[PDB]
Amino acid sequence: PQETLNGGITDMLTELANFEKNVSQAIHKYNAYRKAASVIAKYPHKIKSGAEAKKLPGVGTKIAEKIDEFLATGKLRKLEKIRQDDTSSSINFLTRVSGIGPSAARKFVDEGIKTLEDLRKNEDKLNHHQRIGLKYFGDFEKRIPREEMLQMQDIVLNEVKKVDSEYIATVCGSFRRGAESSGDMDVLLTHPSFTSESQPKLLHQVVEQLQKVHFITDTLSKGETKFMGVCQLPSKNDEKEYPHRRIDIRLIPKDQYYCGVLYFTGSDIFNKNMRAHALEKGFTINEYTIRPLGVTGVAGEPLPVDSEKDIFDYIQWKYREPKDRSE
DNA sequence: CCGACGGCGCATAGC
DNA sequence: GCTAATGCGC
DNA sequence: GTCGG
Ligand code: NA
Ligand code: NA
Ligand code: NA
Ligand code: NA
């Protein structure tokens, strides 16, 4: 539905969500407000009262009251006040730097560091992740058009294959479901030599190749199974530079790969629905495995999985393509 | 009334 | 020095 | 903040 419907309500709830997470450090209220915003954003009517909204799952008595106040006055008193509170709006703002969470944002604002310029002048106080997040603050808040995702995928798959043609790499996330834009790039990597029961340089060799061709420009964190960093598409003769983008690469054991691909393809809602059905059929599906449940509820050993299809086959579901996995 | 609400890889105080 | 907890992001 | 056992 068009934002013209309940965009004022949804924006208000998301704003309240951020202050719960970033200022109050109340992650479950942050998720409460988000869930309310999501269910409202799906509702195909311009909401007329708090009681109407309360019929939706995730909207309770308090959000109903807030909606009544927003509908009658066009604002929320509590939101206006915290909006103009110098310290709270600064803590909320600083968490938009990757690497700055609620605790670091609080500590910063406590000692007078409230803006990006303040952070710039205080690099001594920033860890490595935070410095990168600052350097790319604007680029990281930009979306990635799908054409650029295809160009990024071209490079990633080419260089992975060049390191060892037995690697398997899949770009997941909404991109794999067909999305016209993406927030980051999520790469799932495996190799036949790497199983649950089997090697500490499998991920490193791929990261190193991507750094040697100057696709990966920065590293946020790197271990033996997860890389989080920054990359940038190459520009040409006299064209403007592409923004820097967030990329993650995870190395998964071959026998857990398609459980990983399924899970990191999503959507979140599809995942829950698929996991709901799997239970109803006697299986438990997590990020790693699919296991049968005994009649006492006791989980058995993980079943062999060799494609996404196998998982659908186990739970008597027709294979669905990623484009039809929105829910 | 009252606890759950996701769990885990990697970076960076307490002994 | 080692170990575990915590912040962080996803 | 909302849900549900
Ligand atoms: Na409700
Ligand atoms: Na942040
Ligand atoms: Na953030
Ligand atoms: Na080869």
Angle between helix A102-110 and A7-22 (nearest 10): 70
Active site residue A212: no
- Which nucleotides of strand B are protein-proximal, with an atom < 7 A from a CB? 4-6, 9-12
Q: How far is the CA of A171 from the centre of ligand 4 (A)?
A: 21
Q: Which residue has the tokens 């700055």?
A: A100
As assigned by CATH, the class of the A144-258 domain is alpha beta
Helices (H), chain A: 7-22, 27-42, 50-54, 61-73, 77-84, 86-94, 102-110, 116-120, 128-135, 137-140, 146-163, 173-176, 202-212, 257-265, 268-280, 308-314
Ligand 4 center from residue A205 Cα (angstroms): 14
Residue A145 has which token pair?
């058009």
Task: Specify the DSSP class assigned to residue A293.
Answer: B
Q: Would you say A59 is a known binding-site residue? A: yes
DSSP A66-102: HHHHHHHHSS-HHHHHHHH-HHHHHHHHHTTSTT--H
Give the resolution to one decimal, in Å: 2.0
* Lookup result for tokens 């109050």: A24
Report the phi/psi class of residue A96: left, alpha or beta, with left for phi > 0 and alpha for psi in -120 to 50.
Answer: alpha
Residue type, A190: T
**Backbone dihedral angles phi then psi of residue A105, each to the nearest 5 degrees:** -65, -40
Q: Nearest to residue A65, comparing CAs of A80, A77, A81?
A: A77
Catalytic, out of A21, A66, A135, A281: A66
* Burial class of A191 by CB neighbour count within 10 A (0 to 12, 13 to 18, 19+): buried
Strand C bases contacted by the protein (CB, 7 Å): 6-10
| CATH 3.20.20.60 is right for the domain spanning A259-324 | no
